Each structure stands twice: as C-alpha cells, then as structure tokens.
Amino acid sequence: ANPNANPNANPNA
C-alpha cells in the first residue's frame, strides 16, 4: 500500500 509516500513526489508518474 505504501501509505508513507514522499510528500515531494508526484503521483502522476
């Protein structure tokens, strides 16, 4: 699930 995403990352890979 990876809930602890990097806040700076862009989900729109």
Partner: antibody, heavy 119, light 110 residues
Framework: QVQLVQSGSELKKPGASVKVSCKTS????????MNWVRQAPGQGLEWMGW????????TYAPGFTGRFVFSFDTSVSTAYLQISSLKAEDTAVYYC????????????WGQGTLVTVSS | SVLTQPASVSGSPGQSITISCTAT?????????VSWYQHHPGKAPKLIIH???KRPSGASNRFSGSKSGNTASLTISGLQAEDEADYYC??????????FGGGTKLTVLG
C-alpha cells in the same frame, strides 16, 4: 494562473448518461493528475478517484466502479467525467481537482458541476 | 468515514476554535499527509493546510494545524464571520487513494 473550469449544470432522467468537462489552463496538463470529488445533498466531500494524465490509467474508489469513466483530451488540456446508467443517488455537485504532489493534493479545484437525476 | 470529524463546532468572534480529525484505520500509516479544506457552499473548496501544519502563503495566518497520535487538528484563531464554512480534513491512505473526513460545520456566533 492555474484554472479549472467545468461545464454547466445537468438535468437528467434515471438511466441517462452525462459527461462533465474540466478544462484547464495555466499549467502543463499532462504533468499533474486530475482527481474527481463529489458532494451529494446533505453530505460531505467524497473522493471518487483520479486519472494519470501521462499513462491514462484511471483509479476509481470503491463506490465509483462500474458506471464512471475518467478520461482526458490532451489536444485541449481537458479532463472528463462520464457517468452511465445514471441513478437518482448520483445527484451531486461534481468537482475536478488537481494534485500537485502527495504533500499538496487538491490545490486547485474546479467550480463544481451540479448533476440532478430525477424521474 | 475513515477520518472522524465533529459534525459541528461553534465559537464567537475573536475566540479560537479547534476542529479534530482522527484516523479510523491504520491505512493512514505515518499520518503525515494530512490536508484541510475550507468550503463555502456554492464555491469551490480551498486548500488551507497540507502535510499536517504547512500553510500556503495564500491562506490566512489565523489557520494552523497540528497532530497528536492519530488525531489531526485544525485551529482557527481570531475567529471572524468569514470563517463560517465547512471544513474537511483529508489523508493519503496508500495505493494512490485519498479520503476525506466527514466534514465539520463551523458556526461563528456573531
């Protein structure tokens, strides 16, 4: 300036179809995800899902799988929400909203589109 | 609702008020990706806090956010009439999924 401008109010019979547009400007459309959020009468905001504007992959939350389609047209930097087989309980204001990052979701919102489904 | 907020809070002008937001499941993980939105009915919601406490310069400095355990909290100081609105918290829950709390109607007793 970032702008999300949605289409106008819709009035539909049950079983009909509707397509809501969310035109963007002020940023590169394919750089950021476009999310959709609903507010039914007397209820709160509900996250519906999103579409990746690079891959086209749509993600639908539980509750919005089966009859909902997120799409986009990059030729006009526009995202779309289409609903098939409309039901009375689809009545709601529908918003598009950009996600900038995981840290900053829903930084810019459309003005909302009222969709009324009544027999 | 994955995030529990009080249905309503009231305060009088000039006071400070706090709106809580508690995670109902462990899907929030670290619970560090919490955002808040001000919503005047009829207009679009507005982002006012992200990553628990980060306030964009375009929001009023009377709004602040904090967290303790699994309860995120929005505080509005120097309450004014224009603050009357619905407020929603929001959290990432993994798997590229987001959820909104149920919302809080803030009444400003003016």
């Amino acid at each position: 300036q970032v702008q999300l401008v949605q289409s106008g109010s819709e009035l539909k019979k049950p079983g009909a179809s509707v397509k809501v547009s969310c035109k963007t400007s002020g940023y590169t459309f394919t750089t950021y995800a476009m999310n959709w959020v609903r507010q039914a009468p007397g209820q709160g905001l509900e996250w519906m899902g999103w579409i990746n504007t690079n891959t086209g992959n749509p993600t639908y939350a539980p509750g919005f799988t089966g009859r909902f389609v997120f799409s986009f047209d990059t030729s006009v930097s526009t995202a779309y929400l289409q609903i098939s087989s409309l039901k009375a309980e689809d009545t709601a204001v529908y918003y598009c909203a950009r996600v900038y990052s995981y840290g900053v979701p829903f930084d810019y919102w459309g003005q909302g589109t009222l969709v009324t489904v009544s027999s | 609702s994955v995030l529990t907020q009080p249905a309503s809070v009231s305060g009088s002008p000039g006071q400070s008020i706090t709106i809580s937001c508690t995670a109902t499941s462990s899907n929030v993980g670290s619970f560090n990706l919490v955002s808040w939105y001000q919503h005047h009915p009829g207009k679009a919601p507005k982002l006012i806090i992200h990553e628990v406490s980060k306030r964009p310069s375009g929001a009023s400095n009377r709004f602040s956010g904090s967290k303790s355990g699994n309860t995120a909290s929005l505080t509005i100081s120097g309450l004014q009439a224009e603050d009357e609105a619905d407020y929603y918290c929001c959290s990432y829950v993994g798997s590229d999924t987001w959820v909104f709390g149920g919302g809080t109607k803030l009444t400003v007793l003016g």
